[PDB]
Ligand binder design. Structure first.
Ligand SMILES: [Mg+2]
Ligand SMILES: [Mg+2]
Lengths: 73, 67, 226, 98, 55, 104
RNA sequence: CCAACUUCUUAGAGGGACAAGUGGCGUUCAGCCACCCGAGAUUGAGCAAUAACAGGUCUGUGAUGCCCUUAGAUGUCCGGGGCUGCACGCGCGCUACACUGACUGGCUCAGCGUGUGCCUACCCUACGCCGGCAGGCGCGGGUAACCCGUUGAACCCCAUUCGUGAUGGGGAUCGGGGAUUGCAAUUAUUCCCCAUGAACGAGGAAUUCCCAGUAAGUGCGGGUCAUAAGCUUGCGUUGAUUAAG
């Protein structure tokens, strides 16, 4: 799924939180909170997901918010 | 947009007067009290009544609200 | 023969269900008809007519039952009698909206005043345990130009999706001497049974609070070992 | 219409062996469906049953596009006078059922 | 008359032959899923089919 | 005998087929058979759209009717003499059940 | 049983967030603003009141009143034409005016959805072999989380060629040939090839749409459809700027 840059943010997200979940489960959480320190204060959106989505088209214009041109005369 | 409606502000005064001793100043416990004690039709106004009931529980223990 | 897709089966009995509801309305208009309920089986299927006045679909040993399974047979293509009607008196006779919409259909054909007849029926629904209703008569009343009377009496919601099952709407037509009249009855049903006569699933704009108990024994203690 | 005699007997005998028939208002179909064997198109079934209504012996309504009828009891005592059948030979209008 | 050529223009492919299921229009019909109803006709039984809305 | 059967169930409404799901679940497991669970094939939503107006006058409105059909599906193994008490323990007008042929 | 599982795929029940926590503002009243934690501290839309309009629709309706017509019929059918006619004006929309691009070749990643008919007879098509191309041929699945389909979509990415030129930008116009749909392609139905290469160099007064997965670029699937999208309706992608008298 995805695209070209929708995927490379998806694997960046993935292998960032991959070893964090290996470090909750096979090393201590002191070092997990250590590696979570560097990841969160440097542009936090790695291991927390991006929530927003498509926000669907409506029935009076060519997309979600765009509308057709009105003609008064 | 936060301003709370009438039927939530109506239904809180019927609860907290009648069950002042069966409560606390915790939202998540009083959430469970409000479903037990009166039939709420859906979850959204369940914990939205409970929020305003807790908004009075940190409050009517201090001053003369209609208590 | 060969078999079609599920997406065309569900519309096929969706459009089957609408058609006989159209004709039986055209056929049993005079009876307090009020709908159908159909049961499809790999046996004798079972249509039931919810007519109030159940006599007038019967003749001498079911005249207008047997042919009204035969007109359904030789139209839709059933096998030899895998479909049957059953007439069935509906409870709360004037509380389902279609019934008295068909009643005041024929009560306007006798030549009454509209205000006399509607105050007949508006007092008839609201005596019948209805929490609220309102009835609209539209068309050519006094004058060349046509106007519209409405007779709101009772409480009635208008928006949200719970104007789907607290209410029912019925729209019917009455062919009078000039033009066509318009009938439009809507009735709000009581929550009361959690069951038969009304809807379940209470209306979300009110909180049904209950009392606390008798508050017995707050005093100095007691115990029993048993 | 123009009433071919051997065809009208075939539409009457189906209208006599029960009290129903379900012609459909699309007259440009070559083959009437309930008959489908004795080479009748839909115009023959229309304009014969239309002859009956003005005498009153049959009684109709109309569905979406189907053009149903019912048999008034005067129609039964006429259909015996066309088909030479005694007042023992009856339709299914009276009772065959339980 | 003279059935050699009466209904001869071939009612086949084409929207002069597709029709409305309810009471015989041929305009704006819905052949989706094999319903065969004109747009005006479909709305009245809308629920009677079962196509409820978003709500 | 001995067969391999598959029973299907689908409807417009979901709450009715939720109960018919669990009822045949308990109706095999009261006769202590072996069941594989209710497989969740996705919901088929068809979204036919009309222009809401009879004429051409308006401000270009549209309405979006839709019908969501839900479908669920269950295997069993038992012989097919008891296809009657698989059929006739529920009537339920709004559901449409099928049983796949039992040649295994 | 010649393996264990639900993390993604998918639904179902349920949990979840309320402006409760924290400070500040405020009659310490409704509330407002800052952060704490959190996936989320306003997701998008549908039903939408009273009372109206001489708004629209009698050319959907076996809904209908009135009036007209009723056989040298406005009823009905077949045949050809017509709504497509062009001195001109106006309205939605599609392409372009390039170098942030056009070519050529690599390279690559989506979601919604529809698919063979009671009548109605024409569906999506993978594969194989013929052809520079539309297409033709046999052979098979699919009434469908089964087959098409891990839907190898476009923009874009990268390597070459092209260089400020009315240019290989741009494709109107038009001649000739070639294939399928069909009862019939001419007034060109569409598609393909070769050739022809017009304005157009960022647009006057004026005016429209829009504020975050937003505009906008970009393809895709429905609807209509025998053959058909410059439309509309949906989806994905890349993603910002600012009266008790
Ligand atoms: Mg009409
Ligand atoms: Mg330049």
């Amino acid at each position: 799924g995805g695209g070209h840059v929708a995927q490379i943010y998806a694997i960046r997200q993935s292998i960032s939180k991959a070893l964090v979940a290996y470090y909750q489960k096979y090393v201590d959480e002191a070092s997990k909170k250590e590696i979570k320190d560097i990841l969160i204060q440097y542009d936090r959106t790695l291991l927390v997901a991006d929530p927003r989505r498509c926000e669907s088209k409506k029935f009076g214009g060519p997309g979600a918010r765009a509308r057709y041109q009105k003609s008064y005369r | 947009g936060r301003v709370r409606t009438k039927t939530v502000k109506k239904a809180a005064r019927v609860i907290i007067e009648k069950y002042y001793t069966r409560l606390g100043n915790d939202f998540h416990t009083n959430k469970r009290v409000c479903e037990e004690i009166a039939i709420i039709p859906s979850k959204k106004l369940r914990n939205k009544i409970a929020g305003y009931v807790t908004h009075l529980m940190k409050r009517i223990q201090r001053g003369p609200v209609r208590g | 023969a060969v078999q079609i897709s599920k997406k065309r089966k569900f519309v096929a009995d969706g459009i089957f269900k609408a058609e006989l509801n159209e004709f039986l309305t055209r056929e049993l208009a005079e009876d307090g008809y009020s709908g159908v309920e159909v049961r499809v089986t790999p046996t004798r299927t079972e249509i039931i007519i919810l007519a109030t006045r159940t006599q007038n679909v019967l003749g001498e040993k079911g005249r207008r039952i047997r042919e009204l399974t035969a007109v359904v047979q030789k139209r839709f293509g059933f096998p030899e009698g895998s479909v049957e009607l059953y007439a069935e008196k509906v409870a709360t006779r004037g509380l389902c909206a279609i019934a008295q919409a068909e009643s005041l259909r024929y009560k306007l054909l006798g030549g009454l005043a509209v205000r006399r007849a509607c105050y007949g029926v508006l007092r008839f629904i609201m005596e019948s345990g209805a929490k609220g209703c309102e009835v609209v008569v539209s068309g050519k009343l006094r004058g060349q130009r046509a106007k519209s009377m409405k007779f709101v009496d009772g409480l009635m919601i208008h928006s949200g999706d719970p104007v789907n099952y607290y209410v029912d709407t019925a729209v019917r037509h009455v062919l009078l001497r000039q033009g066509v009249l318009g009938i439009k009855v809507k009735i709000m049903l009581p929550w009361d049974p959690t069951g038969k006569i009304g809807p379940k699933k209470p209306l979300p704009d009110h909180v049904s609070i209950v009392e606390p108990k008798d508050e017995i024994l707050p005093t100095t203690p007691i115990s029993e070992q048993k | 219409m123009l009433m071919p005699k051997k065809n009208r007997i075939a539409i009457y005998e189906l209208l006599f062996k029960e009290g129903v028939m379900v012609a459909k208002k699309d007259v440009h179909m070559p083959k009437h469906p309930e008959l489908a064997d004795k080479n009748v198109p839909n115009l023959h079934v229309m304009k014969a049953m239309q002859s009956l209504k003005s005498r009153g012996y049959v009684k109709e309504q109309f569905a979406w596009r189907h053009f149903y009828w019912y048999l008034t009891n005067e129609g039964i005592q006429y259909l015996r006078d066309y088909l030479h059948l005694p007042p023992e030979i009856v339709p299914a209008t009276l009772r065959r059922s339980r | 008359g003279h059935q050699q050529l009466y209904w001869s223009h071939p009612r086949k492919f084409g929207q002069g032959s597709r029709s409305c299921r309810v009471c015989s229009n041929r305009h704006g019909l819905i052949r989706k899923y094999g319903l065969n109803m004109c747009r005006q006709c479909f709305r009245q039984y809308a629920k009677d089919i079962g196509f409820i809305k978003l709500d | 005998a001995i067969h391999r059967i598959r029973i299907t169930l689908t409807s417009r409404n979901v709450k009715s087929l939720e109960k018919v799901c669990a009822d045949l679940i308990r109706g095999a497991k009261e006769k202590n058979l072996k069941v594989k669970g209710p497989v969740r094939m996705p919901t088929k939503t068809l979204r036919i759209t009309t222009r809401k107006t009879p004429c051409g006058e308006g401000s270009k409105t549209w309405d979006r009717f839709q019908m969501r059909i839900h479908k669920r599906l269950i295997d069993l193994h038992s012989p097919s003499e008891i296809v009657k008490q698989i059929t006739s323990i529920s009537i339920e007008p709004g559901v449409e059940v099928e049983v796949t042929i039992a040649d295994a």
